[PDB]
Short mmCIF file of C-alpha atoms and ligand atoms in Angstrom, two decimals:
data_model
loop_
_atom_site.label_atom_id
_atom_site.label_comp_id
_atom_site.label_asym_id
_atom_site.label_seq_id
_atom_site.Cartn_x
_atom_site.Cartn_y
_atom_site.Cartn_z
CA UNK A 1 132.77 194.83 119.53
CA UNK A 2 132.87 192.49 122.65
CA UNK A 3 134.33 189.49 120.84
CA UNK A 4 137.05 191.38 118.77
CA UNK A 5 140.82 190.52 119.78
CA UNK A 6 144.37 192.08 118.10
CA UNK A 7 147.35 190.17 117.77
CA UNK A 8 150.78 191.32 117.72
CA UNK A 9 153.69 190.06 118.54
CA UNK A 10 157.22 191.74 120.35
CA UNK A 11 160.69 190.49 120.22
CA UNK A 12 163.22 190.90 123.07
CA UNK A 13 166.18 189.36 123.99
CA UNK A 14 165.80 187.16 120.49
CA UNK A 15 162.84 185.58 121.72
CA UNK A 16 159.14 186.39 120.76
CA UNK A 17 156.28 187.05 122.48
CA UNK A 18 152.96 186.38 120.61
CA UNK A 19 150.17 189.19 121.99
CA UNK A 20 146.13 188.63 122.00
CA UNK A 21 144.51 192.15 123.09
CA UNK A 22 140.56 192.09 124.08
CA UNK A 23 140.51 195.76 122.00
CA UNK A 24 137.21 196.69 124.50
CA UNK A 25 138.85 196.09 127.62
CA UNK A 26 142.86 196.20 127.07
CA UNK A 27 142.98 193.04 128.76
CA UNK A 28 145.83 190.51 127.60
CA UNK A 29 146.77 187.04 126.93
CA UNK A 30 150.76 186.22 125.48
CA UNK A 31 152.84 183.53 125.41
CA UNK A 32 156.89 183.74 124.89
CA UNK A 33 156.77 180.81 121.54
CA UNK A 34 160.45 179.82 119.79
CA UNK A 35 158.91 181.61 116.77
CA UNK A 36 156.35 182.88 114.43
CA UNK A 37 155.61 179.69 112.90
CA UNK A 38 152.00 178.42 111.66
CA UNK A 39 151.85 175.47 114.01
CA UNK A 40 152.66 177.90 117.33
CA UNK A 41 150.23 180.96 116.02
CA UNK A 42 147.65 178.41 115.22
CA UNK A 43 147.69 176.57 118.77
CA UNK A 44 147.78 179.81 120.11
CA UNK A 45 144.85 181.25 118.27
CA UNK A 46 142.55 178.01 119.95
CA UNK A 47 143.42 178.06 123.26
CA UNK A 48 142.82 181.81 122.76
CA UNK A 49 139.31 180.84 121.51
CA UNK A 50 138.44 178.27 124.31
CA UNK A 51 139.10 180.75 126.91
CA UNK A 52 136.89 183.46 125.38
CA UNK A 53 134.03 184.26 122.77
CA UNK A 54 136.28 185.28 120.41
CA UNK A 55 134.58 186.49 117.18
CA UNK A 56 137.51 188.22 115.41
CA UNK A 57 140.53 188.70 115.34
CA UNK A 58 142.69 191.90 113.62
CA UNK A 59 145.99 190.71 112.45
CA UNK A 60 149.55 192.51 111.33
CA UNK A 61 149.12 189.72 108.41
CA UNK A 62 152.55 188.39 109.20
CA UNK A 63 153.38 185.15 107.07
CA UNK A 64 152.44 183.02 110.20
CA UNK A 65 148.76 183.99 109.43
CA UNK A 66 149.01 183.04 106.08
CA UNK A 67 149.86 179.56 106.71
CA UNK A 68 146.69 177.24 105.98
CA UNK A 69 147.29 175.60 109.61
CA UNK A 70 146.01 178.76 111.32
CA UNK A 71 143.14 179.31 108.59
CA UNK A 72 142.07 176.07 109.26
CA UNK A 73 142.05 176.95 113.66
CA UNK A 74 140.19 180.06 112.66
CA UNK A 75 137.06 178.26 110.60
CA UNK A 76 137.12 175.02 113.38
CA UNK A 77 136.91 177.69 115.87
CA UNK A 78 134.33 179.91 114.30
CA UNK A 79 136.83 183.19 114.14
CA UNK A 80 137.07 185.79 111.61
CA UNK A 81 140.76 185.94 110.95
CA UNK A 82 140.75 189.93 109.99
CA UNK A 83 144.45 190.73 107.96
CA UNK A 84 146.26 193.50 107.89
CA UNK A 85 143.44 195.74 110.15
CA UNK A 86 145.33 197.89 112.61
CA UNK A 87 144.19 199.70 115.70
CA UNK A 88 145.79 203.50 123.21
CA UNK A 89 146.93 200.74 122.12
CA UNK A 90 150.50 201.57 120.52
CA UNK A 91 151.72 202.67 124.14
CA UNK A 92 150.76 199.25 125.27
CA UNK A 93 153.24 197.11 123.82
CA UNK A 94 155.99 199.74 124.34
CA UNK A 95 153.81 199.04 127.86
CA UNK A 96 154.03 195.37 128.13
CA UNK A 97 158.22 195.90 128.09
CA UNK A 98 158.13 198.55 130.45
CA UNK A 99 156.31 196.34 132.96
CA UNK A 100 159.01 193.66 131.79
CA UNK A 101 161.70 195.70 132.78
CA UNK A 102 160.50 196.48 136.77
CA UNK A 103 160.04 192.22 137.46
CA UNK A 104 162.76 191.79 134.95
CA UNK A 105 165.11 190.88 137.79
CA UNK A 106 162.82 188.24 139.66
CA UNK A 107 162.85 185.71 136.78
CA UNK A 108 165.46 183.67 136.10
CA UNK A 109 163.76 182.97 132.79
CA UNK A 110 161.99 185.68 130.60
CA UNK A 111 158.89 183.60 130.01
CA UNK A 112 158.22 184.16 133.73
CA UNK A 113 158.65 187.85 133.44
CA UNK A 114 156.56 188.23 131.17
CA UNK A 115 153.75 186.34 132.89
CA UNK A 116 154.51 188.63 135.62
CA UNK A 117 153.71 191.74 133.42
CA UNK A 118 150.56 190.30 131.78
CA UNK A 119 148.99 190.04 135.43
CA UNK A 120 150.68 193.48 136.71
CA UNK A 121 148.55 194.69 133.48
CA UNK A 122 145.68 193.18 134.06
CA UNK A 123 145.20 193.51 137.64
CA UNK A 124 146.51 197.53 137.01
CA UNK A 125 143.69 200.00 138.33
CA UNK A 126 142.72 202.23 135.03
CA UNK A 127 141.46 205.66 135.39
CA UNK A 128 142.26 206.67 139.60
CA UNK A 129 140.70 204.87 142.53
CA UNK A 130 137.36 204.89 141.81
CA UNK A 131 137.89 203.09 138.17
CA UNK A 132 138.63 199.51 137.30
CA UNK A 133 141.40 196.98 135.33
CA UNK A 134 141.35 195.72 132.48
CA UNK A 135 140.26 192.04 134.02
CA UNK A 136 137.24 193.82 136.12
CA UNK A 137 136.52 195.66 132.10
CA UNK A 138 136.69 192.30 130.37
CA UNK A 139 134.47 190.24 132.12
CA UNK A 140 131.89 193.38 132.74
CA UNK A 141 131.57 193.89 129.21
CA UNK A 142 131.69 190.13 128.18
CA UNK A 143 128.86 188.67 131.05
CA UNK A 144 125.40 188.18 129.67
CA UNK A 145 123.19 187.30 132.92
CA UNK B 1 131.71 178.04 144.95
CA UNK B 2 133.22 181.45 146.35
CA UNK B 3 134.39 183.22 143.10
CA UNK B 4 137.94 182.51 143.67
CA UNK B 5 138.33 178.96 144.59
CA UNK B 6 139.96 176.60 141.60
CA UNK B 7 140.97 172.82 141.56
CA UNK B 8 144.48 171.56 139.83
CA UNK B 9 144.83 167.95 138.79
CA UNK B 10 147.15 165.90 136.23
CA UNK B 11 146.07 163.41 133.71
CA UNK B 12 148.62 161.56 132.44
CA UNK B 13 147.77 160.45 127.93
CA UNK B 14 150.51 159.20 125.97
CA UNK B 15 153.51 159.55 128.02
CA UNK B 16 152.54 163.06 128.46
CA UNK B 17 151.03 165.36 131.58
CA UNK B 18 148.13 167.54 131.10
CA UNK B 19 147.56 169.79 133.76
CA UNK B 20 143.70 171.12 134.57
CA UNK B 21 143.03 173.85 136.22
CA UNK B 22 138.96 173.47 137.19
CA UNK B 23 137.05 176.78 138.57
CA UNK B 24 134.88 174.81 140.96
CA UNK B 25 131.70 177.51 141.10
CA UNK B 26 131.16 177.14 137.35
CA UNK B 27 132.60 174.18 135.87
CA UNK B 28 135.21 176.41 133.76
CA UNK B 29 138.85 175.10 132.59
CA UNK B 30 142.20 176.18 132.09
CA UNK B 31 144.91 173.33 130.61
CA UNK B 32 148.01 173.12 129.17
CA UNK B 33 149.81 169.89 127.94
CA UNK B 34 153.60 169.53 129.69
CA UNK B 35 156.52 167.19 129.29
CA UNK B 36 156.82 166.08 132.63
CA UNK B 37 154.86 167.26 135.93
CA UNK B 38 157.83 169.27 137.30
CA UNK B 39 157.97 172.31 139.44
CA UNK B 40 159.00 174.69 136.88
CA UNK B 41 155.96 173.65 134.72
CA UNK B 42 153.40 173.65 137.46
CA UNK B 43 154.72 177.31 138.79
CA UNK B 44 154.54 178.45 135.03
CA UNK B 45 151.11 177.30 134.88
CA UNK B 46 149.98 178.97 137.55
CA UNK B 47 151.31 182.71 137.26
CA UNK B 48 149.65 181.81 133.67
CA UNK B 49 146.29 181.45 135.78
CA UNK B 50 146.51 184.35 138.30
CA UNK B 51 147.43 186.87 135.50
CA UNK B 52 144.29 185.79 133.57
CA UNK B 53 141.34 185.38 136.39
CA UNK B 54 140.86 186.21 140.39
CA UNK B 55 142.91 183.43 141.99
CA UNK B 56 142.35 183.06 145.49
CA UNK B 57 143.06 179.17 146.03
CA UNK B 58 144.14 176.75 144.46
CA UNK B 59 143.43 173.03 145.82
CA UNK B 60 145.81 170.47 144.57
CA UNK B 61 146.33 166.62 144.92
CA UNK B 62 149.81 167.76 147.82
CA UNK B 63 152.38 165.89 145.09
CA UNK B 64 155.67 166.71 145.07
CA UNK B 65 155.45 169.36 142.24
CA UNK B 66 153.37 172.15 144.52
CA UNK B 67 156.02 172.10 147.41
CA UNK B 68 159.26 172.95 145.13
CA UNK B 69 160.45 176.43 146.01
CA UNK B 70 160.06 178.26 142.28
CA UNK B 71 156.20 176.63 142.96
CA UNK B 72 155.91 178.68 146.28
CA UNK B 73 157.64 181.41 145.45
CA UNK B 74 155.10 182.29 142.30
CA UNK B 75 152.24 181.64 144.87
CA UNK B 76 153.73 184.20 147.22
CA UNK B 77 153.90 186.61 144.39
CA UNK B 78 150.93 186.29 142.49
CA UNK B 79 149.02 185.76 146.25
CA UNK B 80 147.58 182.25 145.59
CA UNK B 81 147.08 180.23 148.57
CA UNK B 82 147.75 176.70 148.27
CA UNK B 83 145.94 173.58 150.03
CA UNK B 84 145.77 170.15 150.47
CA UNK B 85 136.06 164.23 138.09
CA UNK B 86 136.08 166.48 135.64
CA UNK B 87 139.19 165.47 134.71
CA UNK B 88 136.69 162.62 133.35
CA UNK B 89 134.56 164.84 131.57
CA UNK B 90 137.78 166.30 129.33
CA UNK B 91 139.12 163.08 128.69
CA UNK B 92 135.69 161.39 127.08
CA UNK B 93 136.00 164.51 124.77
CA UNK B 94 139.28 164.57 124.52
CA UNK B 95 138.76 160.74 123.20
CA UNK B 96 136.03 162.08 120.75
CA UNK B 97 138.09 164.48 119.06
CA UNK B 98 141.48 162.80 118.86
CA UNK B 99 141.05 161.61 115.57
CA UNK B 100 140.66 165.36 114.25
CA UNK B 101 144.17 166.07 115.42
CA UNK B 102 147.84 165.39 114.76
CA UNK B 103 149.48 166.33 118.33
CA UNK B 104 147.64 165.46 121.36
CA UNK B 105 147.80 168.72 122.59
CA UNK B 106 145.99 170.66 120.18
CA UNK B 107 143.02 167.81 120.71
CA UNK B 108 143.43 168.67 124.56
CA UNK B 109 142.60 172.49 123.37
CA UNK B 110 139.96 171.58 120.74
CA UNK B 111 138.11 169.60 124.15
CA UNK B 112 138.41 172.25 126.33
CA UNK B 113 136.98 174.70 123.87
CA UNK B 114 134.00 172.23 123.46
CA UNK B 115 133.55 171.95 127.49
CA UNK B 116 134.24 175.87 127.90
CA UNK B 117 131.63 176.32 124.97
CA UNK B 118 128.55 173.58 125.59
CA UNK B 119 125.74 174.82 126.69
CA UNK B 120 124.06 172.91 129.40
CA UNK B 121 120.63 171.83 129.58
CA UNK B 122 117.69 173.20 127.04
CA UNK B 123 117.07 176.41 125.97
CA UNK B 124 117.61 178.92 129.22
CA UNK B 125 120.90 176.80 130.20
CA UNK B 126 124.61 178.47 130.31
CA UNK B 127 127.90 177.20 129.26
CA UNK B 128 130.85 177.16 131.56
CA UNK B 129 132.25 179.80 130.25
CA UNK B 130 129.13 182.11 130.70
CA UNK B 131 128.87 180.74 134.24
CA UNK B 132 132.68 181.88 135.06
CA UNK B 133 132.42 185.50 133.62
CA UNK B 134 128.80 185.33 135.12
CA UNK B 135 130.26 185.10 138.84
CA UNK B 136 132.90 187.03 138.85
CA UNK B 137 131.10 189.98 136.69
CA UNK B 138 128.85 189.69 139.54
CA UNK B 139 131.25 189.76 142.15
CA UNK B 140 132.67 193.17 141.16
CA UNK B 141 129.17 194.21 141.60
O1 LIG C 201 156.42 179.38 126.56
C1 LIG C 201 156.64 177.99 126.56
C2 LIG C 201 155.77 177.45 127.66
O2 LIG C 201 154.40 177.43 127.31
C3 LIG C 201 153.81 176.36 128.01
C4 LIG C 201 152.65 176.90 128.84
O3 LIG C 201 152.48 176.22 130.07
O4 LIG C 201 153.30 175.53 127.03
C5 LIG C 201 153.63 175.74 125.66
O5 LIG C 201 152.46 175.24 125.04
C6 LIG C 201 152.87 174.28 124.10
C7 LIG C 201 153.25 173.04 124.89
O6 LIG C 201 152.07 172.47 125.43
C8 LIG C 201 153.98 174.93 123.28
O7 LIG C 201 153.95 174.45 121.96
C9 LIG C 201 153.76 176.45 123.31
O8 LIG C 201 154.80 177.06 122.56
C10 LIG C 201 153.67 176.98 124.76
O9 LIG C 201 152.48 177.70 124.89
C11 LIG C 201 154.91 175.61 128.79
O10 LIG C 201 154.86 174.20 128.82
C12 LIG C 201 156.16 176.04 128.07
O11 LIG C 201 157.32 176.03 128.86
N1 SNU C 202 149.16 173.41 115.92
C1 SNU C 202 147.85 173.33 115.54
C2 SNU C 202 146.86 174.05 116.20
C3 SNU C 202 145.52 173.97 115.80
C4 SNU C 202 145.09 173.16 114.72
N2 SNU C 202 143.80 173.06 114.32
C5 SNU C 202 143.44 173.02 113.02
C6 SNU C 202 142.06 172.91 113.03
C7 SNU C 202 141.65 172.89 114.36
C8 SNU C 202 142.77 172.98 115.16
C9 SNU C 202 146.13 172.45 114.09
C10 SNU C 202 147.47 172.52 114.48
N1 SNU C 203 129.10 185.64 127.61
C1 SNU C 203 129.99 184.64 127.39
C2 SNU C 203 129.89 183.78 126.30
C3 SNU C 203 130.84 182.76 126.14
C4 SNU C 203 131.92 182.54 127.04
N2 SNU C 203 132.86 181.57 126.93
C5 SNU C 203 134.12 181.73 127.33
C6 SNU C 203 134.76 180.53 127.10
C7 SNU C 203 133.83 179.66 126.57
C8 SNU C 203 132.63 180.34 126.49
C9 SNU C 203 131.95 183.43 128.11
C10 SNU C 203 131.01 184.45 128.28
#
């Protein structure tokens, strides 16, 4: 379970915002990308994959991961590209644009608010003052030694 | 070495900048392949960073790009403190993978997947990437 990731993606203000979500930890990775092309999901898919042991990943099997560019990232990279496999999650990407909307007004640029949300997210305290964030869960569950 | 502490530094390939990010305890990287070394990019770059690891400091080369105000600013916000080789290491890979790529950049991705990825030494060594989640697991206690 430590290596599997979701993607989605989420569109606002006509721009898109491609998702990865470590589904152990609820820890995120996204980039704002022109659109869901093959060439942009694929590049993001690697860098995803040199940053992390990613195994698998769960997919909304848009047509972007059905181009043979991002096939071909997946088996250079060693990933499991998982279709159409969907997994509280749901309230995080309703979550993500909440967290948009209180730096929304610091950015000139929305690419920069929502880099601002993925670390408000990630640094976020789960579970009261004793309990940890999702960057504190990631790395806990992904160390070895 | 404290759990924190990361290097930036440019390398400039094919009329392009890459910027690496180096976390100096373990060896680890972070890059991303820009147009030009401007203020916006470098600022981008690192609230990328800080939203994805510990950031404590970041120690740069003092060019023009990590003064600009939208630079600062990001620091202030994402509380990054700013002061004043293996950039050799990525670009000897980066030189023996270019040939499996179209676009420089994704060969810049495929080489720091390779350098995040290689184990070093014999059996009992780590990779980089071990070594980063390693230190920081172990910083949380
Ligand atoms: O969101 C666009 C933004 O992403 C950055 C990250 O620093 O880089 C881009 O990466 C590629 C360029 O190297 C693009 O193809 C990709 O869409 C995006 O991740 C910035 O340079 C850029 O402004
Ligand atoms: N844009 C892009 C990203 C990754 C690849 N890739 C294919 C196999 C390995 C990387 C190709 C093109
Ligand atoms: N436990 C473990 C394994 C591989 C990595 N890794 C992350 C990027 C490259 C390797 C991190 C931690």
């Amino acid at each position: 379970s430590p290596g599997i990731w979701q993607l989605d993606c989420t569109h606002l203000e006509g721009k898109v915002i491609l998702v990865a979500v470590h589904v152990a930890s609820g820890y995120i990775e996204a980039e704002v990308i022109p659109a869901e092309t093959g060439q942009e999901t694929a590049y993001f898919l690697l860098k995803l994959a040199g940053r992390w042991p990613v195994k698998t990943v769960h997919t909304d099997n848009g047509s972007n991961f059905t181009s043979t560019t991002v096939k071909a990232a997946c088996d250079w990279a060693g990933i499991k590209q998982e279709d159409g496999i969907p997994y509280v999650i749901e309230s995080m990407n309703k979550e993500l644009k909440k967290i948009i909307g209180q730096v929304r007004d610091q950015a000139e640029h929305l690419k920069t608010a929502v880099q601002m949300a993925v670390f408000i997210h990630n640094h976020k305290r789960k579970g009261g003052i004793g309990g940890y964030s999702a960057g504190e869960r990631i790395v806990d569950i992904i160390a070895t030694d």
